[PDB]
Design a protein around this ligand. Structure first.
Ligand SMILES: [Mn+2]
Ligand SMILES: [Mn+2]
Length: 199
């Protein structure tokens, strides 16, 4: 499933496919942007199937409802919601268009790679473990981005040899998505990615 949306400040593309012969995606995503800010989140429920989706959809819903709060605060509420659920890995990203600034909070193997046309990249190593409901250290990265920045957030279903070069050489989220298409066909796992090109 490919979903594209743009406004003045960001062109986005979301790609989501279910694990082979599964009827429900274990991964979730949330995406909302208006003229001031963007919020998005990608979550991978443990395992797959409906109870993976139960955990990842609950994260999706919390991000939506608490979108006004800061990232750490939202991720906390997600951890709480994972009590007696399978749990999930997830990343949450807020962008303030007016300040060209982002805050990022993640737990587990969901990956965020930002590429700036000035060659600089932001590529935070993922926090170990998952959102299980147990007490969890959270870390927020806050940073300025450059006009023309290209980023991806993706679950571990997307395994690409050199994901940064794709972000570099592609000139639109469409181009980048197409260069990655060949890594999306195995269906060994649910596969979700968000691509953004920032004005
Ligand atoms: Mn999963
Ligand atoms: Mn996965």
């Amino acid at each position: 499933m490919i979903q594209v949306e743009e406004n003045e400040h960001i062109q986005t593309l979301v790609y989501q496919l279910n694990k082979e012969g599964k009827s429900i995606c274990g991964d979730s995503f949330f995406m909302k942007a208006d003229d001031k800010e963007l919020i998005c989140a990608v979550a991978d429920g443990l395992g797959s199937g409906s109870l993976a989706n139960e955990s990842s959809a609950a994260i999706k819903d919390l991000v939506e409802n608490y979108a006004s709060e800061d990232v750490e605060s939202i991720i906390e509420r997600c951890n709480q919601a994972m009590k007696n659920k399978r749990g999930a890995t997830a990343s949450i990203l807020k962008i303030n268009f007016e300040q060209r600034q982002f805050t990022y909070c993640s737990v587990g193997n969901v990956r965020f790679i930002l590429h700036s046309p000035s060659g600089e990249s932001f590529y935070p190593l993922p926090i170990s473990g998952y959102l299980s409901g147990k007490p969890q250290k959270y870390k927020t990265h806050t940073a300025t981005y450059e006009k023309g920045s290209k980023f991806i957030i993706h679950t571990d279903g997307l395994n690409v040899p050199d994901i940064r070069s794709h972000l570099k050489k592609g000139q639109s989220v469409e181009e980048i998505s197409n260069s990655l298409k060949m890594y999306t066909t195995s269906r060994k796992d649910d596969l979700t990615y968000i691509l953004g090109q920032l004005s």
